[PDB]
Amino acid sequence: SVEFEAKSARDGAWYDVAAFLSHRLFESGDPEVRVRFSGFGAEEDEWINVRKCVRQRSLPCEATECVAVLPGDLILCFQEGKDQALYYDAHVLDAQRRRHDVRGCRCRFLVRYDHDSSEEIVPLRKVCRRPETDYRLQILHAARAAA
């Protein structure tokens, strides 16, 4: 299973990491790592900033995990446009809570993409949360029960 994702210089989108091949520039305090992306090959390999542009993989959200998605959060969000659909950093502007049903979460999230400042209302299917929001599932168990 993939553990990490990395931001591509081509498009500013985030992609799953297949392997870290090498690293450099540690002595600078700002190391880079040579990334082989999942589903791609050697041609798409990049040197990527370790501190800011590599991270633990975002978590596709299901069911009542929506309680861990709050206004203000950074999320990784699937941006479906006219001719492309890629995962981009976005911030949640608003969380509209709605009745869950047999297919799970019906909540709607107004998001703003960080790279183009565009705004969209998305369903939970498009939302991947950062692992550092997991703790909220423990706090908000009663909200999960309510949903």
Partner: peptide
């Protein structure tokens, strides 16, 4: 890990 939605890529240029 759960599967992400499949990326759809394009060259741009329109």
């Amino acid at each position: 890990a759960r599967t992400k939605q499949t990326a759809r890529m394009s060259t741009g240029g329109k």
